[PDB]
């Protein structure tokens, strides 16, 4: 009928930075109605190895290099030197 994929989620305050190799801590929430509605537009995967060209291929979620996030939008572009 209306089967939805419920994913357990957690709000952390101490995080490993994505900018550079660091750690950061933010204040706890103040709002009691944090609400987001995003549109999955993609996926960033990775494949299991040691089974090259064989019958199965395992693919797991990935991410981490935020560059790979800009790359998905900028792929079709390029800067050429103009006179």
């Amino acid at each position: 009928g209306s089967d939805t994929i419920t994913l357990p989620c957690r709000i952390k305050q101490i995080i490993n930075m994505w900018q550079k190799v660091g750690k950061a801590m933010y204040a706890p929430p103040i709002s009691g109605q944090i609400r987001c509605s995003s549109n999955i537009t993609g996926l960033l995967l990775t494949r299991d190895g040691g089974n090259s060209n064989n019958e199965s291929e395992i693919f797991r979620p990935g991410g981490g290099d935020m560059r790979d996030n800009w790359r998905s939008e900028l792929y079709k572009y390029k800067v050429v030197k103009i006179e």
Partner: protein, 170 residues
């Protein structure tokens, strides 16, 4: 080992579509090939003053609020052979993921299982004629890597996604 104590403030982070235009004596060349696939000699192409409305969303394993493929699901990687390299996937249709600070994110079961078989219709083998495609979840590593981490309403969410990547197809 630099520690910095700033007046940690409760602000609200909002994404402003960022347009990137031509930098100095350079020119931006947009490839118009509806299904341009990464590296290669783009046939249909043209100069532009600025790219397009790019929404800088920081998050893991799931690209959100961005550009979709206008034709079919297109994947891209530097080397589809080296298992160590990230494979980006551009989706055909958008999927929704509604989340709240109350600890959960729900996404339609049907909508997402469909995109999975679509992505499955072309994995590593390279749109391979056929073989078994398996979706498992993260092997391990940082919380931001092992879970769909993102900044929702200013706060940092770490959504457990074992349920999105745990299935088998052919």
């Amino acid at each position: 080992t630099s520690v910095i104590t700033q007046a940690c403030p409760k602000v609200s982070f909002e994404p402003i579509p960022i347009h990137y235009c031509a930098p100095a004596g350079f020119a931006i060349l947009k490839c118009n090939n509806k299904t341009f696939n990464g590296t290669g000699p783009c046939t249909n192409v043209s100069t532009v003053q600025c790219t397009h409305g790019i929404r800088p969303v920081v998050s893991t394993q799931l690209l959100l609020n961005g550009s979709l493929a206008e034709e079919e699901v297109v994947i891209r990687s530097v080397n589809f052979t080296d298992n160590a390299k990230t494979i980006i996937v551009q989706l055909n249709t958008s999927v929704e993921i509604n989340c709240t600070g109350a600890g959960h994110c729900n996404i339609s079961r049907a909508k997402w299982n469909n995109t999975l078989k679509q992505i499955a219709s072309k994995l590593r083998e390279q749109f391979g004629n056929n073989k078994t495609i398996i979706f498992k979840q993260s092997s391990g590593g940082d919380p931001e890597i092992v879970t769909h981490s993102f900044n929702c309403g200013g706060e940092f969410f770490y959504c457990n996604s074992t349920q999105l990547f745990n299935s088998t197809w052919f």
